[PDB]
Amino acid sequence: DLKLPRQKVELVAPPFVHAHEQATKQGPKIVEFKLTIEEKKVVIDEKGTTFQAMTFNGSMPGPLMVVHEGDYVETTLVNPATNTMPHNIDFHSATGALGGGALTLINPGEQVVLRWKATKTGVFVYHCAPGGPMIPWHVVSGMNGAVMVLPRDGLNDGKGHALKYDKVYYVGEQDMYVPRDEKGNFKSYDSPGEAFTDTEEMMKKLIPSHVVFNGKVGALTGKNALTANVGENVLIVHSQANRDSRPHLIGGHGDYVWETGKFGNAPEVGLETWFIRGGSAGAAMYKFMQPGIYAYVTHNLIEAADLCATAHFKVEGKWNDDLMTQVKAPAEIP
Amino acid sequence: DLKLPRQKVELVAPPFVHAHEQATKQGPKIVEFKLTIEEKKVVIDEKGTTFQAMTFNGSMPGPLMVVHEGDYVETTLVNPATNTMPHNIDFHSATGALGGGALTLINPGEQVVLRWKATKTGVFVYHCAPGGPMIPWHVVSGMNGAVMVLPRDGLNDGKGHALKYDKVYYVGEQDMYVPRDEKGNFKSYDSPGEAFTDTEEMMKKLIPSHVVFNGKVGALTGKNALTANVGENVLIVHSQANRDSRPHLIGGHGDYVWETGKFGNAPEVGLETWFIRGGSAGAAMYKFMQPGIYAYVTHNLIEAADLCATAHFKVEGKWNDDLMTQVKAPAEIP
Amino acid sequence: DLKLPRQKVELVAPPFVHAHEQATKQGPKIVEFKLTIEEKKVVIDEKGTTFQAMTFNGSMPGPLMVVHEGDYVETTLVNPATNTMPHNIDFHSATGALGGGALTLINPGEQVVLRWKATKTGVFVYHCAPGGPMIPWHVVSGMNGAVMVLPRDGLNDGKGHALKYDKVYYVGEQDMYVPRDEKGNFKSYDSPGEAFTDTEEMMKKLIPSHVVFNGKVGALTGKNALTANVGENVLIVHSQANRDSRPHLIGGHGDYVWETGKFGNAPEVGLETWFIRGGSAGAAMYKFMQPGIYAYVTHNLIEAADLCATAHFKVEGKWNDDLMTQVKAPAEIP
Numbered sequence A, B, C: 001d002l003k004l005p006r007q008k009v010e011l012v013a014p015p016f017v018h019a020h021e022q023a024t025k026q027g028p029k030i031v032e033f034k035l036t037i038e039e040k041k042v043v044i045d046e047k048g049t050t051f052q053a054m055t056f057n058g059s060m061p062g063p064l065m066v067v068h069e070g071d072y073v074e075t076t077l078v079n080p081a082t083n084t085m086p087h088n089i090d091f092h093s094a095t096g097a098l099g100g101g102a103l104t105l106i107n108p109g110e111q112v113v114l115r116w117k118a119t120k121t122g123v124f125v126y127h128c129a130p131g132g133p134m135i136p137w138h139v140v141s142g143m144n145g146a147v148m149v150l151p152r153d154g155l156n157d158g159k160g161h162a163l164k165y166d167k168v169y170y171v172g173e174q175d176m177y178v179p180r181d182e183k184g185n186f187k188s189y190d191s192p193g194e195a196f197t198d199t200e201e202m203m204k205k206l207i208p209s210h211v212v213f214n215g216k217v218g219a220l221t222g223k224n225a226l227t228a229n230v231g232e233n234v235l236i237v238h239s240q241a242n243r244d245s246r247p248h249l250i251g252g253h254g255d256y257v258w259e260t261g262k263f264g265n266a267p268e269v270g271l272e273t274w275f276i277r278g279g280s281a282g283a284a285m286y287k288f289m290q291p292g293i294y295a296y297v298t299h300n301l302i303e304a305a306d307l308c309a310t311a312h313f314k315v316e317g318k319w320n321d322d323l324m325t326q327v328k329a330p331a332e333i334p
């Protein structure tokens, strides 16, 4: 059958990304991944609101999988008996059978092994899609992540120059729909099944209660701020499986941006704000020039500041007064 | 006056497209079309919800008109006396007089003949726009379609290679605003006029009750699924006259995509999901690689699965195990 | 310290733009601007609805600032003692300190002077961002504008040809959130502070009551319509600091469009409708071909016609019957 070398990957939780090569001299391999589904009640904000989450590998988003063009991605999807619902997986990077969804439906207690050839480069969403109304419900419950398919020569700028990142982060954005009771408090539920009727009613009204990165308000702040140093080129992969987003690095730019997320297209340069279409992943790289704190947001600022969609970067290095300076500090008007 | 050959087109209902050439050796012609407006009460979902529709040629969307750059498009717009409202037409492909709207206002019982030169290539919306608050109301009642203006040399990839499609489909997406009564059932009305006050109130809240393709939930499924064979290159024109959409072919890609819809720009390649700005048409071509059923959706999955915005393709041919295979069918976890 | 020539600019209120060069033989300068914040109650519609606005220089949007790549932009931001709140400024064109926001927080009675180097070309949002939930509130209260950073050689089409505009207009789009009382009338408030709790509650629901250009329904109509002549190339800069928009010139096109707004990228050509991601500015140029009235809208037509987002152009010149003609005026159907 398929006679290529096998390579296992140990996935790591977002926003971090498992170790990988950008450019590689390896030829095609069968790259082996395991995703174990976990349904669990989680806390999504600083007020203690709870949420019936459904996850790949315990996280929102599911972890970033990284391969190269022409690799074969062999995923063991596991649905333990401790879960209540069937689940599957649709890879937007894959060709056929509803992205794999038609070949991966598993009941609690089952697993399945799907292989797909990575013929399309870029960052792509993966998500659960059991069928019918279950599709949006599983997705907005957290069951989505992304996979990055790099060219074997690494990234380029479309003008012949290599673009090498010093680090990569994966920001998965999640629209969440938590119903409220009559007096206006968020509801808690004993199971995903019990949450479904109220949650679907809200979903159909198309206004989320929360829009978060990495599964919670504030997830990518404080101890868990993203980091960089002045001089480092950082790739930020952003996904949104269900709803549009408009990423922006406050105090920075997107030096090279693939907003549609596909490396067969040259990046755009020098963006302020870019656009992640719901159902996609995109990527932006930026070389930090200034130390200090940055915020990384969706630039619907209501969503960013009030519904949860803000991350921070803490950046080390030397301030550049040529690029920016406070000529006169705040003072009384003359 | 204008001394060119005249060619009549027999329009066909969406999602099909009237016969045309891609590349042509014909020079400019006056291409003659007729659109007859029909106001009618229709059923829009499988529950039997009704809707006061306003249409060009009896369909939602109106039919796709196809011409070549430099042709003159001569449209006889007819508003029969059996209708209740005035109507007109604005072609986004046309130059001057509000796209034609300022030259085509016709009362019931009248017709008008407008000619415009097709100086801009791409796919474009056309829609009714009588004036003032009537503009959105006529559009979201169904009065919109599209027109495709092909280069005379056919389509290309921006790198010198021809792109020829084997077939083309037109998917018109419609945001609909059907009010509900106090207990939560959709309302029915005796005329568009009677539907207006409740419908406008809802419209201004910017949340549709239904988002459909080809005028109804399920229109492009079952007997009426789109079709292809493995090896066929299919062009999918997508329009949305009032509201954004994010098309996605589940199990496929956009091999070549003009998301802004204009053929003077090279297509993007290898997309997962693309973006149709409200007030526009875009186009994507894909060469099918795998047989089976595909879904074509807007990738707000709530809209797709719960509000109506899903089409199917049924594709014939041989499965390609190199691209995808089920290595191990669902089984008990060891 | 920084030993370059200083040049003062006298800002002008939108939609007009202060005098500037496109291509220039000047080298880098320190270009001096002053922005004075004004909190004020204004009328936003033809019904007399009032609104607690917060502005740079008294206008919504704040005025367009125009410089060239490599200039240094030195802004004196003034917060008079007659205001009630602290304020600051974040330039999306700037690098470091949250775009300047971390260096410009001023209480009523204070001013501050910030300099930033214009290292990124394009049109960019600037906006207030005091911190936390105040960020969206100040922005949607009106505290946003834009800055254009031109290449020193002026604009080009990406194919070696200069693009010179005959005039430029700045259309700032504002999503506004005015609460209603129980019977359904818009509320009035005595201060921004008093408006905050009801306004934030509404904001978080993500549906504006009004979407306007230049601060009011109808602002860019009648006496204050935009103007052009047949043959003139007009640049239209469009910004939206918080929420997406989809500009469209009814009866025209975007001949050259930078929808992401950044001049290091070639423009797209021949668009019908383009997309301004919330948190950005973009630009479109069009050479008028036909006289008469045009509407310039967001092509969510509900927003355009019903919530306020329509401007007009009045264009002088000779009608071109080759491009469009009414072959037969409205007449009884035979």
Ligand SMILES: OC[C@H]1O[C@@](CO)(O[C@H]2O[C@H](CO)[C@@H](O)[C@H](O)[C@H]2O)[C@@H](O)[C@@H]1O
Binding pocket: A151, A156, A157, A158, A159, A160, A263, A264, A265, A266, A267
């Ligand atoms: O960045 C992708 C963009 O760059 C071009 C060159 O303009 O092609 C480059 O990237 C391709 C994909 O990695 C390489 O195959 C090619 O050799 C390299 O020049 C464009 O063709 C492409 O759209």
Ligand SMILES: OC[C@H]1O[C@@](CO)(O[C@H]2O[C@H](CO)[C@@H](O)[C@H](O)[C@H]2O)[C@@H](O)[C@@H]1O
Binding pocket: B151, B156, B157, B158, B159, B160, B263, B264, B265, B266, B267
């Ligand atoms: O696909 C459009 C894109 O292709 C280029 C070549 O890079 O031009 C091609 O298409 C034009 C429009 O059909 C032809 O006139 C031209 O001859 C052909 O090379 C780009 O200029 C254009 O943006």
Ligand SMILES: OC[C@H]1O[C@@](CO)(O[C@H]2O[C@H](CO)[C@@H](O)[C@H](O)[C@H]2O)[C@@H](O)[C@@H]1O
Binding pocket: C151, C156, C157, C158, C159, C160, C263, C264, C265, C266, C267
């Ligand atoms: O329009 C920007 C686009 O044009 C290209 C040429 O294809 O570069 C032009 O514009 C640059 C920025 O103004 C100039 O530096 C350059 O000399 C000029 O050719 C592209 O490289 C660019 O993306």
Ligand SMILES: O=N[O-]
Binding pocket: A180, A181, A182
């Ligand atoms: O109190 N129930 O929503």
Ligand SMILES: O=N[O-]
Binding pocket: A248, A249, A250, A251, A301, C090, C092, C099, C129
């Ligand atoms: O610049 N950010 O809100």
Ligand SMILES: O=N[O-]
Binding pocket: A293, A294, A295, C098
């Ligand atoms: O305080 N920084 O976003």
Ligand SMILES: O=N[O-]
Binding pocket: A316, A317, A318
């Ligand atoms: O990294 N030095 O501050």
Ligand SMILES: O=N[O-]
Binding pocket: A330, A331, A332, A333
């Ligand atoms: O703060 N005094 O100038």
Ligand SMILES: O=N[O-]
Binding pocket: B180, B181, B182
């Ligand atoms: O029952 N009327 O909405």
Ligand SMILES: O=N[O-]
Binding pocket: A090, A092, A099, A129, B248, B249, B250, B251, B301
């Ligand atoms: O892959 N589609 O939901």
Ligand SMILES: O=N[O-]
Binding pocket: A098, B293, B294, B295
């Ligand atoms: O069952 N297919 O979408």
Ligand SMILES: O=N[O-]
Binding pocket: B316, B317, B318
């Ligand atoms: O077309 N053959 O299955």
Ligand SMILES: O=N[O-]
Binding pocket: B330, B331, B332, B333
């Ligand atoms: O289904 N049994 O492995």
Ligand SMILES: O=N[O-]
Binding pocket: C180, C181, C182
């Ligand atoms: O009447 N108060 O909303």
Ligand SMILES: O=N[O-]
Binding pocket: B090, B092, B099, B129, C248, C249, C250, C251, C301
């Ligand atoms: O063409 N404009 O609605």
Ligand SMILES: O=N[O-]
Binding pocket: B098, C293, C294, C295
């Ligand atoms: O009447 N013109 O929009």
